């Protein structure tokens, strides 16, 4: 139990790290699409008024 359980703590830490990496990337993609949509709205509204 001094070299077996510690070989599962590493796997748990690594999977948690990967999951939070993925969540951060999801948030970043959200930021880019928000910016793109707002600028498309603001550039297409100027042609009509």
């Amino acid at each position: 139990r001094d070299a077996a359980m510690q070989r599962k703590l590493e796997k748990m830490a690594d999977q948690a790290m990967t999951q939070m990496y993925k969540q951060a990337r999801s948030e970043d993609k959200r930021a880019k699409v928000t910016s793109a949509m707002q600028t498309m709205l603001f550039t297409m509204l100027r042609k009509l008024d």
């Binding site: 703590l9 830490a13 948690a16 790290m17 999951q19 969540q23 951060a24 970043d28």
Partner: protein, 585 residues
């Protein structure tokens, strides 16, 4: 997710309990959390026990329980301390170098911005360190201003006079123009659109910008904004080139800018040049003369306030072709002789609060003393120029530091630009004091100016002091000197030609007492820069560190170009000033 402030390695840990939540790397954030009281850190998710009805917030008391962070009493049988191995849990654990010295950032983070030592740390710390320090200072100041009471107007006396009631539980802000109110007109739905105001004792006297008719129920507060994170450093790296890069030299000269051109060669050749400009040596002309020196090159006229930018616009109407000028003001009354919101213009005039992100050839940053490291770096954030010019002087008025309680901030540590020109020195100088007579120039030259600013015309013998004592009984945020108020009028009684001298006062409320007894206009010492008059009278009032600082007063004495009156209670400076002291009735 970003790069950490200290180590620049990418990180996902932001100190939650800290004021501005800067990015911190794994070992870096661990050092911060173990060396501060900040025990909340925010990763891509906040580090708190997610189990219902829990309040544990410290990073060391929470362990990785499944897909959440759990404390000792909330964990499942499997667990993992996220505060282990001397490195807090966070992204890029392997790619983390840490910081050998973390005590400086801990001190700046737990800093309460109370004494002078905090500003010493802010100036002495590195680039990102001082940028974060300025951001924290501004955030703390803007949060503190809203922490004061509400200025509810409950009854209307007359024009320029009101009665003001305040919210319970929090104190009252001072009664000067340093802090600007912003009221809103309360309706059945919400409150909106009154304007910026300044209050003073009357009964209270209110100072509004536009015409208004204030009624009952309207209140004013020290409205704050949202301080955005900063990117650029205070100053670009220095680079002395071989020649004047990218600029085409002038064909023929103008005599009044002949001495100005001599200092323009190195400026057009080197990246940035700090300017040692004493009050009124032609600094506004100096920025104007660059356009005469280089008409094609576009110049950005920027200062901390539009009233200071007005000085650049004051000389733009007579010397600069208006068709190529532009003043930028967002949606306050000021100069608008140019076209507003014209980015692609040859000449652009604006204030640090509204200049768009563009590029230019050479910058003119008027009044570098007033702005801190915050606005110092914001110009490099907006605009990266090929050359830079910083109009101002460390031997001038700093900003009013409201949280500065213990100690007075030294002239060098006002900001990054103010530091280096008493270590390496200025790159150009103007010794032509176009206003002050021989009495004032030689006095201020031997004070901080290294006997380097020389007299202009003659010893007018129109500047006087008086070896006086003074008596002060103070109030919430001012001080008044009854004997000195009685001295000035008595001195004006039999020499009436002095009745055109504008009375100066460090505490503007004191002259309001004088303006009732006498009637002559008022001068604010902290805001006397830019304005000047032939005849001005001044009472020194208090000898404390607020009034008789050798350099904070130095602007007031330089207001006069022919003569001044000053009644000195102080002796530290009166023994030095070479003016004439007359009898005491």
């Amino acid at each position: 997710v970003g790069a950490c402030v200290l180590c620049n390695s990418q990180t996902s840990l932001r100190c939650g309990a800290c004021i501005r939540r800067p990015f911190l790397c794994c070992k870096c954030c661990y050092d911060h959390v173990i060396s501060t009281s900040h025990k909340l850190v925010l990763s891509v998710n906040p580090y708190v026990c997610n189990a219902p009805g829990c309040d544990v917030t410290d990073v060391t008391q929470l362990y990785l329980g499944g897909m959440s962070y759990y404390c000792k009493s909330h964990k499942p049988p499997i667990s993992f301390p996220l505060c282990a191995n001397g490195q807090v849990f966070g992204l890029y654990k392997n790619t983390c170098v840490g910081s050998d010295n973390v005590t400086d950032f801990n001190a700046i983070a737990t800093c309460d911005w109370t004494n002078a030592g905090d500003y010493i740390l802010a100036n002495t710390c590195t680039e990102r360190l001082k940028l974060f320090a300025a951001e924290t200072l501004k955030a703390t100041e803007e949060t503190f201003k809203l922490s004061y009471g509400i200025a509810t107007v409950r009854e209307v006396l007359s024009d320029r006079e009101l009665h003001l009631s305040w919210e319970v539980g929090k104190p009252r802000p001072p009664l000067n123009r340093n802090y600007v109110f912003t009221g809103y007109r309360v309706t059945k739905n919400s409150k909106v659109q009154i304007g910026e105001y300044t209050f003073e004792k009357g009964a209270v006297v209110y100072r509004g910008t536009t015409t208004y008719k204030l009624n009952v129920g309207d209140y004013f507060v020290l409205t704050s904004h949202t301080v955005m994170p900063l990117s650029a450093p205070t100053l670009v790296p220095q680079e002395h080139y071989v020649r004047i890069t990218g600029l085409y030299p002038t064909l023929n000269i103008s005599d009044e800018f002949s001495s100005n051109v001599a200092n323009y060669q190195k400026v057009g050749m080197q990246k940035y040049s700090t300017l040692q400009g004493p009050p009124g040596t032609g600094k506004s002309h100096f920025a104007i003369g660059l356009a005469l020196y280089y008409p094609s090159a576009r110049i950005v006229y920027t200062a901390c306030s539009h009233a200071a930018v007005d000085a650049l616009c004051e000389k733009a109407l007579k010397y600069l072709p208006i068709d190529k000028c532009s003043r930028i003001i967002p949606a306050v009354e000021c100069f608008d002789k140019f076209k507003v919101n014209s980015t692609l213009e040859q000449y652009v005039f604006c204030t640090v609060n509204a200049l768009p992100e563009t590029t230019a050839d050479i910058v003119v940053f008027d009044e570098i003393s007033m702005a801190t490291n915050y606005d110092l770096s914001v110009v490099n954030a907006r605009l990266r120029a090929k050359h830079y010019v910083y109009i101002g002087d460390p031997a001038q008025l700093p900003a009013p530091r409201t949280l500065l309680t213990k100690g007075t901030l030294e002239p060098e540590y006002f900001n990054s630009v103010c530091r280096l020109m008493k270590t390496i020195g200025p790159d150009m100088f103007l010794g032509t004091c176009r206003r002050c007579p021989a009495e004032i120039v030689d006095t201020v030259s031997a004070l901080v100016y290294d006997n380097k600013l020389k007299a202009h015309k003659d010893k007018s013998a129109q500047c006087f002091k008086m070896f006086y004592k003074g008596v002060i009984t103070h109030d919430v945020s001012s001080a008044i000197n009854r004997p000195q108020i009685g001295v000035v009028r008595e001195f004006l009684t039999r020499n009436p030609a002095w009745r055109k001298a504008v009375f100066i006062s460090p505490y503007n409320s004191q002259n309001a007492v004088a303006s009732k007894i006498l009637g002559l206009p008022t001068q604010t010492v902290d805001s006397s820069q830019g304005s000047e008059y032939d005849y001005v009278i001044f009472t020194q009032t208090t000898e404390t560190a607020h009034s008789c600082n050798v350099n904070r007063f130095n602007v007031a004495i330089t207001r006069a170009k022919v003569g001044i009156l000053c009644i000195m209670s102080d002796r530290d400076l009166y023994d030095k000033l070479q003016f004439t002291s007359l009898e005491i009735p």
